[PDB]
Amino acid sequence: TEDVIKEFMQFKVRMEGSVNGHYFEIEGEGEGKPYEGTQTAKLQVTKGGPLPFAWDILSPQFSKAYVKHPADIPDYMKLSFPEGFTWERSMNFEDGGVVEVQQDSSLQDGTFIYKVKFKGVNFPADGPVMQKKTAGWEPSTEKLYPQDGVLKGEISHALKLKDGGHYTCDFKTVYKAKKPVQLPGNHYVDSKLDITNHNEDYTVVEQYEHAEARHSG
Ligand SMILES: [Cl-]
Ligand SMILES: [Cl-]
Ligand SMILES: [Cl-]
Ligand SMILES: [Zn+2]
Ligand SMILES: [Zn+2]
Ligand SMILES: [Zn+2]
């Protein structure tokens, strides 16, 4: 994939979303090293700001072309380019909050283009998302497996709380190449997403993610 996906690649992203009815839009840009599994993003809230809910529920929605894969695990997301792939995700939180996300990824004239639609509902008014009591995602491991002609991933995930406990969230994601490409077998991806900067009202935010694929255990 060295001809299509270079060792340095940039991306642009736009998200339209709502949380408990509150509409917003975010635009951003990012860059990274797809074969090393590292990337940065800078996001700006362009509508609906300042957001009255935790940034953290948005952060994993702003880039699977940048996961380091061993040679022996087919890198389905990289192989999908230039046409690209789509993903659809549910996030089911312990307190009944639920998010659904739909994303389209393409490569256009050397730059990745990401389009995201986000909808979160049923977050309790006094819960940690609406009260902005979260403090970032734990490091995670996604279990990936082929099924029904697509790649599926599950994470038993958790957000840290400012008080030091956790707020758990089950992720289910379906990744679909836009053309037929070789599916990998079962594997795991370790990710770590850090919010590295933000302004006081989270209308400008910087993120960094490191992600690497491997076999079980
Ligand atoms: Cl992956
Ligand atoms: Cl290996
Ligand atoms: Cl993959
Ligand atoms: Zn191996
Ligand atoms: Zn993979
Ligand atoms: Zn913990």
Distance 214 CA to ligand 4 centre (A): 7
Distance 72 CA to ligand 2 centre (A): 6
Q: Number of C-alpha atoms within 13 angstroms, CB side, residue 172?
A: 6
Distance 23 CA to ligand 5 centre (A): 32
End-to-end CA distance of the chain: 28
| Residue 115: both structure tokens together | 């389009």
Q: What is the 3-state secondary structure (H, E, C) of the chain?
A: CCCCCCCCEEEEEEEEEEECCEEEEEEEEEEEECCCCEEEEEEEEEECCCCCCCHHHCHHHCCHHHCECCCCCCCHHHHCCCCCEEEEEEEEECCCCEEEEEEEEEEECCEEEEEEEEEEECCCCCCCCCCCCEEEECCEEEEEEEECCEEEEEEEEEEEECCCCEEEEEEEEEEEECCCCCCCCCEEEEEEEEEEEECCCCCEEEEEEEEEEECCC
Distance 177 CA to ligand 1 centre (A): 12
Name the resolution in angstroms. Answer: 1.6
Give the residue among 133, 131, 202, 130 at the shortest CA–CA distance from 167. Answer: 133
Amino acid code (one letter) for 62: F
Distance 122 CA to ligand 5 centre (A): 32
Closest ligand, as measured to the CA of 183: 3
Distance 129 CA to ligand 6 centre (A): 17
Distance 147 CA to ligand 1 centre (A): 14
Q: In angstroms, rounded to a whole number, what is the distance separating the alpha carbons of residues 171 and 154?
A: 6
Decide: 54 and 136 in contact? Cβ < 8 Å.
no
Distance 120 CA to ligand 1 centre (A): 24
Distance 156 CA to ligand 5 centre (A): 17
Decide: 64 and 175 in contact? Cβ < 8 Å.
yes
Neighbouring residues of the ion ligand 4, judged by CB less than 5 Å: 72
Decide: 101 and 117 in contact? Cβ < 8 Å.
yes
| Residue 63: both structure tokens together | 């880039």
Distance 109 CA to ligand 1 centre (A): 23
CATH number of 1-217: 2.40.155.10
Closest ligand, as measured to the CA of 140: 6
Give the residue among 125, 94, 135, 114 at the shortest CA–CA distance from 21. Answer: 125
Distance 190 CA to ligand 2 centre (A): 14
Distance 211 CA to ligand 2 centre (A): 15
Distance 41 CA to ligand 3 centre (A): 21
